[PDB]
């Protein structure tokens, strides 16, 4: 009697001043699901077509976000902009103007936290991505659809747009939505997944009618509702703080990776969104692949209000010369080096640590690497140029880069597990994985990376090393 | 310095409409003057142009309906950062 999707986003233990904007097709605003909670702006910018059909997409999504019976955030107030015509087609320019309209509205008549849902996609667009970034930096939360072409989301916009929350779709079996050659987009530009198949919601067919629809937009609509609710509880959240919560509250490792192309399984977050039940937050950030130079370098960055606590690297062939943490524009960045040598990925661990400063100590595998007082070691990075004790980083000829943090209310512990293609070691419950690395052994390691709170080392003995922290 | 961009997915392109993006500090007054400059230089060449929208608030710049033939000229206008051909978006 509770639709599968709404049950799925309800956490295992469970118990307004936010406005949600929708850029879509026309809306049937008097539908009983949403009547009185959606304000039609009458902003309209659509290309000519080449009636109940006209508002089916938009009405269903408004319902998923705020519908009385089938909505995620049942008490959410919405505002709609028309940027998609009756055939569900829009333009980049129309979307730019709509986004500009949202900003001007806000300057004229300021309200509270704003969530903008963008249930649409086109090809990669420099200008649309730039506009979204500027709107996000102005303090607005953007939630977008990953796209429906069973493709890398980085090739689409606004899905690839830095700072927007990009959402992919899973079904009742927590498997990625697929329909022949079509299905959910994936990859490193996707932040998480949410229910996106067989989603019951308002049908614009009749004022009380319901229909089941599927899409990365339906999935994005769940995240916008979760986001609206989270901002109601914590109106002061920054976009980075909202993203870290979405990730932290998500169900983890439930998607069967096999559905994605092989090279994309590492890059694709295995997260299905969920509401919070009524701290140190960390996330893993993958870079774009470095390319095949011998001097090629991949760079992974954190958000401005995030701290880079660790930095690891990964190459499928294994031909790599490690990684380093280095300051770029007054911000610690993660840099990975390719060996002679198809290329590498840089893998950052970005965390929300206030009452924290953090510094990098570059030294050889030097005996303690955070020599200071009350200072915790959060991560060990390592690089070399040839191709052939809680506070100390072990290595072989290699240069070490240690992330050292001053966080009086913070405790860290280092856990090792040594044994093969994959070795893992996980932090205990209540602990956050801040650093992940492998010790050099009688096996050539392809690299290491953090998957939620699990440290993964890939090799062709092998030992995984996880640094785990928590507040106290 | 000014660059041109068009959608990589060919069936999604909308030739004849361009988003002209100006350098970040450009004031709305400059965007309008740059757009009028384009129109005038275009007119001198026998081209009709239509300024559909002037942007301000997110990005400075404007939307222009014109022949692609004018891109080399428009790329030479003062304050221009990049120009992007309009393209389609779809309900997902």
């Amino acid at each position: 009697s509770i639709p599968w999707n709404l049950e799925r986003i309800t956490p295992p233990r469970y118990r307004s001043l936010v406005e949600v904007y929708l850029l879509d097709t026309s809306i049937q605003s008097d539908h009983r699901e949403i009547e009185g909670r959606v304000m039609v702006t009458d902003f309209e910018n659509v290309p000519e077509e080449d009636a109940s059909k006209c508002d089916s997409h938009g009405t269903h999504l408004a319902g998923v976000v705020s519908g009385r019976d089938a909505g995620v955030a049942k008490g959410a107030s919405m505002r709609s902009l028309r940027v998609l015509n009756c055939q569900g087609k829009g333009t980049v320019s129309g979307t730019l103007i709509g986004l500009e309209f949202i900003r001007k509205s806000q300057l004229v008549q300021p309200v509270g936290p704003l969530v903008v849902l963008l249930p649409l996609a086109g090809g990669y667009s420099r200008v649309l991505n730039a506009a979204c970034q500027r709107l996000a930096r102005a303090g607005v939360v953007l939630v977008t659809a990953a796209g429906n072409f069973r493709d890398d989301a980085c090739l689409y916009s606004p899905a690839s747009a830095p700072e927007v929350i990009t959402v992919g779709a899973t079904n009742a079996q927590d498997q990625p939505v697929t329909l022949g050659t079509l299905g959910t987009n994936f990859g490193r530009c996707v932040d998480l997944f949410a229910p996106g198949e067989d989603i019951i919601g308002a049908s614009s067919d009749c004022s009380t009618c319901f229909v089941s629809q599927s899409g990365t937009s339906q999935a994005a609509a769940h995240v916008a509702g979760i986001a609206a609710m989270m901002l109601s509880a914590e109106p002061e959240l920054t976009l980075a703080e909202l993203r870290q919560r979405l990730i932290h509250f998500s169900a983890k490792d439930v998607i069967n990776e096999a559905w994605f192309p092989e090279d994309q399984r590492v890059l694709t977050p295995n997260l299905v969104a969920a509401l919070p039940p009524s701290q140190l937050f960390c996330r893993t950030v993958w870079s774009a692949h470095s390319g095949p130079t011998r001097m090629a370098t991949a760079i992974a960055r954190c958000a401005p209000d995030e701290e880079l606590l660790s930095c690891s690297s990964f190459s499928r062939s294994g031909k790599r010369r490690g990684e380093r943490m280095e300051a770029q524009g007054g911000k610690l960045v993660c840099r990975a080096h390719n060996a002679f040598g198809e290329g590498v990925y840089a893998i950052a661990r970005c965390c929300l640590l206030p009452q924290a400063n953090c510094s990098v100590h570059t030294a050889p595998p030097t005996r303690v690497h955070c020599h200071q007082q009350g200072h915790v070691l959060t991560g060990c990075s390592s690089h070399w140029e040839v191709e052939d004790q809680p506070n100390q980083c072990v290595g072989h000829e290699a240069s070490i880069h240690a992330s050292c943090c001053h966080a009086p209310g913070l405790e860290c512990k280092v856990k090792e597990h040594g044994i093969q293609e994959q070795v893992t070691v996980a932090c205990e419950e209540g602990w956050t994985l801040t650093g992940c690395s492998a010790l050099p052994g009688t096996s050539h390691v392809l690299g290491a990376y953090a998957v939620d709170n699990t440290c993964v080392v890939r090799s062709r003995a092998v030992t995984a090393v996880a640094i785990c922290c928590r507040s106290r | 310095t000014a660059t041109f961009h068009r959608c990589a997915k060919d069936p999604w392109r909308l030739p004849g409409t361009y988003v002209v993006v100006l350098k970040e500090e450009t004031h709305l007054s400059q965007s309008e003057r740059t757009a009028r400059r384009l129109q005038a230089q275009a007119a001198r060449r026998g081209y009709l142009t239509k300024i559909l929208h002037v942007f301000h608030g997110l990005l400075p710049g404007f939307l222009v309906k014109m022949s692609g033939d004018l891109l080399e000229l428009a790329l030479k206008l003062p304050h221009v950062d990049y120009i992007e051909e309009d393209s389609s978006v779809f309900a997902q």
Binding site: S56, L182, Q213 | -
Partner: peptide, 15 residues
């Protein structure tokens, strides 16, 4: 479920 109102699916059972 799949409706053609969402690009680019036709009418198909979903679930």
């Amino acid at each position: 479920x799949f409706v053609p109102t969402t690009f680019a699916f036709a009418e198909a059972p979903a679930x």
